[PDB]
RNA sequence: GCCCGGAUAGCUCAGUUGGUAGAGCAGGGGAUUGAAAAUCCCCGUGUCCUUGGUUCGAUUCCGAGUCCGGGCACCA
């Protein structure tokens, strides 16, 4: 019935799962009983380690005092898995106990080419700064992390390199903004576009987004009948749309969020940001935009003499609900005076 | 660094600091100013630390109106060099400040700001200060 | 028995006390071939271990297993 109820040399009922050899009889009492077991005796006769116990048996143990130890033969002489998970650590804690040494030479190998290149700490505590995320429970694991690779280092060696200052590395990510020029190159050869600018209730008409100012749902958006080559959706309350000769060419059109599927991939939204210039500021404004669903195309930024920075975000955003929420995501620091577009 | 763009001479004599201020003796382009009460040199380093502490406290500055400017340069030798053998290379800059000289101003912000604003800049100058309103 | 963390693309590895997700390689897309390599470029291509859970989105926060990794206890 999945368990054996065996007896100890006193005569107490020892509740263990079924199929147990007398090696499994040891670890219910104490783990060092398994460290010192030689043989076994059940009911007068010695029994072999090849014997599997039955429910209701008195098991006497031939135990050395402190002299003897395990082998590789015992690692499959553990039938019951919960006692075998002790056996998964039993033969481990004498082999890995040796392998703290090969851990120690190779844990301290991987540090100084990645971490103690620049730290140079003696006596070291930076390798023991991973005593807060990993369940070390003592210093044995932090020194034998590679001796078994149950911790699987270059994860914990990357925890050594967790120091992410990244001021030049954001300028390296400003170079990513330099290298991303080529996202307009999928805007030859067509782009996946719906009827998104609904032209006065009439669909399927040639319109284009205005480069004077970007058509977004702030003020309403108006299509100007050009002489040709397209129709510009000039985003009313623009200085170009207000000074129009031939007002008949302006057409009241729709931004068309009313359809089945809204436009998932609107883009080209440039944002003017006037913030006060301090240190540790320009990276963090890029960091709130980081991990937010927003692609950055141009980082044009400068600060005056009086350190009120005039920076610009020619970025990508898709909805006015996506815009105005992210508009209230440049304001996490409160050093920034205002924001425009 | 408020650096002058092109100066007639790289190096000048160090001058003697006697007399009152010629001009800049009363705040008039703002309403809350700061006269110095003593006389020493003031560098671009002593204006950078001055001008930063102006706007960190105000959090929205109207204007600042930095009056003085580092006109006169100054030189020293490279270190561990025996005397003589040429006046050294120009190293920093000096704003020549007589006592009673209006240093900074505050444009249109309240007194309890301004009493605390020019306080936080007075500990970046080597000169005792006082608080002067517009008259 | 006890508690303490990881359960992330195909594979490596970034997201981390809350923005669903990257990057590398592999791999695929076709040009050209018997198909390869070479040359031309393109593309992420994810039960975030499940079960639940306070919800006006959770890979992370919480419990519950399971699982991995531990060091303490328990001598018949």
XYZ file of C-alpha atoms (C1' of nucleotides) in Angstrom:
552
model
C 0.000 0.000 0.000
C 2.833 2.326 -1.169
C 4.538 2.312 2.267
C 6.456 -0.140 4.435
C 6.018 -0.013 8.210
C 9.327 -1.428 9.372
C 10.827 -1.657 12.851
C 13.911 -0.020 14.367
C 16.209 -1.905 16.824
C 14.013 -0.566 19.628
C 10.833 -1.748 17.910
C 9.282 1.545 16.851
C 7.216 1.575 13.663
C 9.284 3.275 10.955
C 6.952 4.624 8.266
C 8.839 4.624 4.953
C 7.591 4.309 1.358
C 7.519 0.834 -0.123
C 10.352 -0.942 -1.907
C 13.053 0.173 0.519
C 16.451 -1.486 0.819
C 18.107 -1.277 4.290
C 20.157 1.654 2.965
C 16.835 3.524 2.876
C 16.244 2.315 6.447
C 19.168 4.441 7.660
C 18.197 7.979 6.642
C 14.849 8.028 8.449
C 16.793 7.727 11.712
C 19.736 10.016 10.903
C 21.757 10.872 7.816
C 25.084 9.914 9.416
C 23.674 6.414 9.972
C 23.862 6.143 6.191
C 27.363 7.626 6.348
C 28.445 4.804 8.668
C 26.382 1.787 7.547
C 28.271 -1.373 6.594
C 25.713 -4.183 6.652
C 22.254 -5.079 7.888
C 20.542 -7.808 9.908
C 16.834 -8.629 9.673
C 15.502 -11.257 12.106
C 18.643 -13.194 12.973
C 20.182 -13.480 9.525
C 22.196 -10.840 7.788
C 20.412 -9.476 4.754
C 22.141 -8.300 1.615
C 21.947 -4.715 0.391
C 20.147 -6.348 -2.582
C 17.242 -7.080 -0.210
C 14.111 -4.924 -0.319
C 12.247 -4.547 2.962
C 8.645 -5.546 3.620
C 5.966 -4.082 5.878
C 6.473 -5.272 9.444
C 10.160 -6.177 9.735
C 12.782 -5.595 12.426
C 15.924 -4.208 10.786
C 19.221 -4.119 12.679
C 22.087 -2.114 11.189
C 25.773 -2.996 11.106
C 27.142 0.495 11.675
C 30.773 1.538 11.775
C 31.644 4.125 14.403
C 33.198 6.914 12.314
C 35.499 4.960 9.998
C 33.854 4.092 6.682
C 32.119 5.774 3.768
C 30.089 5.444 0.570
C 30.882 4.415 -2.995
C 29.463 4.809 -6.482
C 27.565 1.516 -6.182
C 25.054 2.979 -3.736
C 23.675 5.682 -6.048
C 21.176 3.239 -7.581
C 20.796 1.354 -4.304
C 18.172 3.941 -3.349
C 14.748 2.818 -4.542
C 12.472 5.316 -2.773
C 12.927 8.674 -4.486
C 12.572 10.883 -1.399
C 15.360 8.913 0.246
C 17.062 8.906 -3.159
C 16.856 12.703 -3.211
C 18.824 12.477 0.013
C 21.088 10.069 -1.912
C 21.135 12.700 -4.670
C 22.789 14.852 -1.972
C 24.450 12.038 0.036
C 27.116 10.993 -2.464
C 27.094 14.594 -3.697
C 28.177 16.062 -0.352
C 31.378 13.991 -0.362
C 32.196 14.340 -4.059
C 31.193 18.010 -4.247
C 32.974 18.440 -0.892
C 36.136 17.564 -2.801
C 34.852 19.643 -5.734
C 34.696 22.842 -3.682
C 38.424 22.933 -4.545
C 37.924 22.757 -8.319
C 35.047 25.123 -7.697
C 37.339 27.535 -5.852
C 40.002 27.703 -8.564
C 37.399 28.129 -11.316
C 34.938 30.415 -9.502
C 37.887 32.735 -8.891
C 38.902 32.168 -12.525
C 35.758 33.700 -14.020
C 35.774 36.777 -11.752
C 38.881 38.763 -12.635
C 38.348 38.737 -16.414
C 34.772 39.993 -15.920
C 34.428 41.507 -12.418
C 37.827 41.998 -10.740
C 39.173 43.491 -13.947
C 37.941 46.860 -12.661
C 36.912 46.255 -9.033
C 40.174 44.746 -7.637
C 38.863 43.866 -4.172
C 41.149 42.041 -1.721
C 39.785 40.750 0.573
C 36.880 40.017 -1.799
C 33.226 40.459 -0.944
C 31.895 41.118 -4.474
C 31.720 37.373 -5.157
C 29.794 37.074 -1.882
C 27.440 39.877 -2.977
C 25.305 37.154 -4.576
C 24.294 36.107 -1.034
C 20.983 37.973 -1.480
C 19.366 36.468 -4.620
C 20.598 32.853 -4.574
C 19.762 30.398 -1.806
C 23.363 29.860 -0.713
C 22.401 28.992 2.940
C 26.212 28.980 3.669
C 29.402 29.823 1.733
C 29.750 26.334 0.185
C 27.628 27.150 -2.874
C 29.247 30.502 -3.739
C 32.668 28.804 -3.890
C 31.560 25.532 -5.531
C 29.217 27.123 -8.092
C 31.182 25.650 -11.006
C 32.225 22.421 -9.265
C 28.867 20.917 -10.215
C 27.164 23.766 -12.182
C 23.904 23.282 -10.376
C 24.135 27.060 -10.056
C 25.364 27.258 -13.710
C 27.768 30.197 -13.575
C 28.017 33.040 -16.124
C 24.587 33.631 -14.663
C 26.129 34.438 -11.277
C 29.201 35.874 -13.024
C 26.780 38.236 -14.747
C 25.461 38.993 -11.250
C 29.041 40.092 -10.595
C 28.668 42.499 -13.539
C 25.297 43.778 -12.258
C 26.895 47.245 -11.827
C 25.138 49.047 -14.692
C 26.094 52.720 -14.584
C 25.662 53.110 -18.368
C 26.213 56.748 -19.241
C 28.379 56.040 -22.286
C 26.333 52.875 -22.865
C 23.270 55.059 -23.435
C 25.392 56.973 -25.935
C 26.122 53.525 -27.352
C 22.330 53.244 -27.506
C 22.321 56.699 -29.080
C 24.544 55.041 -31.685
C 21.766 52.447 -32.016
C 19.525 55.402 -32.940
C 22.235 56.284 -35.482
C 22.285 52.712 -36.843
C 18.471 52.383 -37.001
C 18.288 54.829 -39.931
C 16.855 52.341 -42.378
C 13.460 51.895 -40.758
C 12.159 54.321 -43.430
C 13.546 51.757 -45.944
C 10.425 49.608 -45.396
C 8.481 52.663 -46.603
C 9.303 52.179 -50.141
C 7.731 49.023 -51.665
C 4.445 49.694 -49.860
C 3.405 49.419 -46.226
C 0.607 47.455 -44.573
C -2.034 50.171 -44.395
C -5.786 50.146 -43.816
C -8.131 52.951 -44.909
C -7.051 54.697 -41.656
C -7.676 58.299 -42.689
C -11.371 58.069 -43.533
C -12.038 60.840 -46.046
C -15.356 62.446 -45.007
C -17.105 59.086 -44.773
C -15.672 57.973 -48.140
C -12.957 55.314 -48.040
C -10.093 54.174 -50.298
C -8.723 57.583 -51.263
C -5.106 58.678 -51.661
C -4.066 60.554 -48.519
C -0.757 61.034 -46.736
C 0.339 62.053 -43.264
C 1.338 65.708 -43.066
C 4.979 66.497 -42.364
C 4.111 70.055 -41.300
C 2.680 68.617 -38.086
C 1.802 65.018 -37.328
C -1.911 64.092 -37.565
C -2.925 62.715 -34.163
C -6.249 62.968 -32.256
C -5.658 66.289 -30.547
C -7.436 68.866 -32.602
C -9.284 67.422 -35.598
C -7.427 66.519 -38.781
C -8.277 68.054 -42.163
C -7.339 66.899 -45.657
C -6.142 69.560 -48.104
C -6.823 68.857 -51.771
C -3.411 69.469 -53.297
C -2.645 70.164 -56.931
C -1.674 66.495 -57.133
C 0.756 63.859 -55.744
C -1.475 63.058 -52.735
C -3.714 64.661 -50.120
C -2.142 66.071 -46.954
C -3.933 65.561 -43.629
C -2.636 68.793 -42.157
C -3.843 68.325 -38.515
C -5.907 71.542 -38.006
C -4.504 74.194 -35.649
C -1.367 74.302 -37.797
C 0.204 77.520 -39.142
C 0.275 75.950 -42.615
C -3.380 74.887 -42.562
C -4.573 78.231 -41.169
C -2.979 80.460 -43.832
C -4.551 78.510 -46.721
C -5.497 80.228 -49.898
C -8.453 78.362 -51.494
C -10.210 77.097 -48.364
C -12.441 74.905 -50.587
C -9.509 72.488 -50.943
C -9.727 71.656 -47.218
C -11.829 68.532 -46.592
C -13.209 67.519 -43.164
C -12.001 63.931 -42.863
C -12.044 61.257 -40.154
C -9.242 59.706 -38.130
C -11.297 56.456 -38.147
C -11.069 54.742 -34.803
C -14.712 53.734 -35.377
C -13.929 50.696 -37.555
C -13.491 47.014 -36.674
C -9.725 47.004 -36.071
C -7.987 50.254 -35.176
C -4.677 51.172 -36.776
C -2.181 49.070 -34.843
C 0.989 50.634 -36.279
C 0.811 54.408 -36.442
C 4.195 56.078 -36.067
C 6.249 59.265 -36.738
C 5.342 61.291 -33.649
C 8.006 63.877 -32.830
C 7.864 65.239 -29.275
C 9.393 68.480 -27.969
C 10.634 68.251 -24.369
C 11.912 71.210 -22.319
C 13.547 69.857 -19.177
C 16.004 71.283 -16.700
C 19.512 69.920 -17.231
C 21.092 67.954 -14.391
C 23.205 64.797 -14.182
C 21.734 61.323 -14.398
C 18.771 62.924 -16.184
C 19.171 62.260 -19.918
C 19.515 58.496 -19.471
C 16.464 58.189 -17.215
C 14.232 60.095 -19.641
C 15.384 57.540 -22.211
C 14.779 54.801 -19.614
C 11.078 55.440 -18.996
C 10.664 55.301 -22.776
C 12.758 52.123 -22.611
C 10.648 48.948 -22.060
C 7.602 50.994 -23.102
C 6.040 50.077 -26.468
C 7.741 52.951 -28.294
C 10.385 52.962 -31.031
C 12.904 55.824 -31.055
C 14.054 57.171 -34.424
C 15.979 60.348 -33.591
C 17.528 61.703 -30.400
C 18.079 65.418 -31.010
C 18.954 67.062 -27.715
C 20.870 70.071 -26.462
C 21.160 72.177 -23.321
C 21.561 75.936 -23.030
C 24.028 77.869 -20.879
C 21.506 78.050 -18.009
C 21.051 74.228 -18.117
C 17.444 73.939 -19.251
C 17.794 71.239 -21.883
C 15.938 71.517 -25.192
C 15.616 67.891 -26.274
C 13.421 66.230 -28.883
C 11.954 62.739 -29.314
C 11.157 61.850 -32.919
C 9.601 58.577 -31.782
C 6.880 56.123 -32.775
C 3.498 55.879 -31.058
C 0.289 54.330 -32.297
C -2.800 55.725 -30.533
C -3.827 58.912 -28.749
C -4.412 56.576 -25.802
C -0.901 55.318 -26.521
C 0.346 58.896 -26.961
C -1.136 60.716 -23.971
C -0.352 57.865 -21.583
C 3.279 57.900 -22.737
C 3.100 61.732 -22.672
C 2.534 61.218 -18.950
C 5.552 58.902 -18.847
C 8.228 61.514 -19.534
C 7.133 62.905 -16.158
C 8.634 60.474 -13.683
C 11.381 62.883 -12.791
C 9.932 66.294 -11.905
C 12.905 68.322 -13.169
C 11.172 68.666 -16.550
C 9.300 71.944 -16.959
C 7.054 71.193 -19.941
C 6.523 69.037 -23.022
C 5.394 69.952 -26.548
C 5.280 68.462 -30.055
C 32.783 78.481 -17.694
C 31.905 81.996 -18.844
C 34.922 82.316 -21.085
C 35.776 85.474 -23.020
C 36.101 84.680 -26.684
C 39.222 86.571 -27.793
C 41.309 88.686 -25.430
C 43.926 91.294 -26.367
C 46.391 89.962 -23.803
C 46.846 86.500 -22.361
C 48.069 87.715 -18.995
C 47.766 90.784 -16.799
C 49.102 92.159 -13.578
C 47.074 91.157 -10.573
C 45.841 94.607 -9.534
C 45.158 96.193 -6.158
C 41.697 95.964 -4.624
C 41.150 99.389 -3.085
C 38.078 101.570 -3.482
C 34.356 101.094 -3.801
C 32.621 99.685 -6.847
C 32.508 101.975 -9.864
C 29.123 100.702 -10.994
C 26.853 97.815 -10.048
C 26.263 99.359 -6.640
C 22.483 98.862 -6.548
C 20.096 96.230 -7.888
C 17.900 97.607 -10.670
C 17.341 94.928 -13.341
C 15.794 92.693 -10.681
C 14.143 93.200 -7.297
C 16.197 90.894 -5.045
C 19.970 91.186 -5.287
C 23.183 90.450 -3.430
C 25.941 92.956 -2.731
C 29.302 91.653 -1.677
C 30.705 93.014 1.574
C 34.424 92.323 1.022
C 36.855 92.087 -1.884
C 38.647 89.132 -3.428
C 38.854 87.318 -6.739
C 35.989 85.265 -8.168
C 36.489 82.549 -10.795
C 34.315 80.867 -13.393
C 34.373 77.964 -10.951
C 32.886 80.335 -8.380
C 30.144 81.284 -10.838
C 29.293 77.737 -12.008
C 28.776 76.689 -8.391
C 26.952 79.980 -7.883
C 24.584 79.750 -10.858
C 23.703 76.080 -10.278
C 22.610 76.683 -6.680
C 20.418 79.544 -7.911
C 18.089 77.356 -9.953
C 18.180 74.151 -7.922
C 16.233 75.926 -5.176
C 13.943 78.145 -7.242
C 12.952 75.204 -9.545
C 11.651 77.704 -12.142
C 13.819 80.777 -12.634
C 12.512 83.981 -14.104
C 15.957 85.425 -14.793
C 19.331 85.279 -13.053
C 21.154 88.484 -14.170
C 24.769 87.564 -13.469
C 26.398 90.989 -13.259
C 30.133 90.404 -12.946
C 32.256 88.746 -15.596
C 35.722 87.207 -15.426
C 37.629 89.811 -17.432
C 41.095 89.569 -15.900
C 42.974 86.276 -16.343
C 45.675 84.933 -14.050
C 48.753 82.759 -14.444
C 50.874 80.436 -12.393
C 53.864 78.293 -13.172
C 53.825 74.528 -13.563
C 54.518 72.967 -10.208
C 57.986 72.558 -8.636
C 59.785 75.235 -10.661
C 62.368 77.696 -9.331
C 61.611 81.421 -9.435
C 62.017 83.630 -12.439
C 62.050 82.341 -16.029
C 58.915 83.866 -17.436
C 55.380 84.517 -16.321
C 53.508 81.232 -16.477
C 50.706 80.075 -18.719
C 47.171 81.381 -18.093
C 45.256 78.902 -15.978
C 41.828 80.118 -14.921
C 39.824 83.333 -14.848
C 39.118 86.114 -12.371
C 36.161 88.427 -11.927
C 37.483 91.506 -10.138
C 34.986 92.328 -7.399
C 35.098 95.499 -5.298
C 33.027 95.589 -2.086
C 29.474 96.780 -2.475
C 29.220 95.214 -5.937
C 25.865 93.746 -6.921
C 26.693 90.172 -7.873
C 23.398 88.492 -8.776
C 19.716 89.355 -8.999
C 16.366 87.601 -8.640
C 13.539 88.475 -11.025
C 10.043 88.560 -9.583
C 10.073 85.680 -7.080
C 8.910 86.067 -3.467
C 11.018 87.094 -0.477
C 10.977 83.786 1.417
C 12.342 82.174 -1.728
C 14.873 84.970 -2.239
C 16.029 85.033 1.395
C 16.735 81.324 1.007
C 17.937 81.565 -2.609
C 20.865 83.933 -2.127
C 21.639 82.121 1.127
C 22.405 78.949 -0.832
C 24.813 80.828 -3.112
C 26.616 82.837 -0.423
C 28.398 79.699 0.771
C 29.932 79.273 -2.671
C 31.727 82.618 -2.609
C 34.694 83.675 -0.463
C 32.930 86.942 0.400
C 30.426 87.936 3.081
C 27.089 88.844 1.516
C 23.985 90.843 2.314
C 20.480 91.029 0.913
C 19.427 94.157 -0.988
C 15.982 94.940 -2.413
C 15.142 97.213 -5.334
C 15.130 100.934 -4.624
C 11.522 17.699 8.850
C 12.865 22.825 8.096
C 13.218 27.085 5.515
C 15.277 30.176 2.017
C 15.416 31.265 -4.918
C 15.581 29.796 -10.257
C 11.465 27.253 -12.823
C 12.145 32.836 -19.770
C 12.224 31.656 -27.394
C 15.062 26.160 -31.265
C 19.437 26.930 -28.219
C 22.233 30.491 -25.256
C 20.685 34.713 -22.412
C 18.272 40.346 -21.228
C 13.872 41.545 -19.046
C 13.359 41.729 -11.978
C 10.461 43.345 -6.232
C 4.700 45.757 -12.004
C 5.103 47.407 -18.575
C 3.785 40.457 -22.442
C 9.575 40.468 -23.779
C 14.746 41.421 -26.150
C 19.717 40.073 -27.931
C 23.245 36.434 -29.917
C 23.669 32.024 -32.612
C 20.951 28.400 -34.890
C 17.040 28.192 -38.062
C 13.797 29.742 -41.908
C 12.477 33.675 -46.596
C 13.836 33.862 -51.884
C 17.544 35.401 -55.617
C 21.436 30.456 -57.914
C 22.056 25.952 -58.198
C 21.450 18.526 -58.034
C 21.199 20.882 -53.432
C 25.010 22.992 -50.918
C 29.102 26.704 -49.668
C 30.099 31.394 -51.855
C 27.535 36.037 -53.124
C 22.090 39.289 -52.442
C 19.493 40.294 -48.297
C 14.956 39.181 -44.960
C 12.737 37.329 -40.417
C 11.969 36.570 -33.742
C 10.272 32.569 -34.743
C 7.757 32.595 -26.542
C 1.937 27.373 -22.275
C 7.373 33.460 -19.294
C 6.788 25.695 -14.871
C 1.687 24.924 -13.932
C -2.476 25.387 -10.398
C -4.831 29.407 -8.041
C -5.069 34.213 -6.196
C -6.517 40.326 -3.805
C -7.728 42.976 -10.625
C -9.079 48.737 -13.426
C -3.486 44.826 -17.578
C 1.218 40.960 -14.093
C 7.342 37.105 -16.677
C 7.864 39.099 -11.383
C 3.659 40.231 -5.749
C 1.082 35.993 -2.633
C -0.246 30.993 -1.400
C -0.535 26.097 -3.153
C 1.688 21.796 -5.166
C 5.366 19.920 -8.358
C 10.507 20.638 -9.493
C 15.579 22.211 -9.176
C 19.264 24.156 -6.012
C 20.992 24.516 -0.757
C 22.342 24.249 4.468
C 20.617 23.367 9.232
C 18.366 19.842 12.333
C 16.926 15.116 13.625
C 21.998 8.178 15.999
C 17.440 3.114 17.060
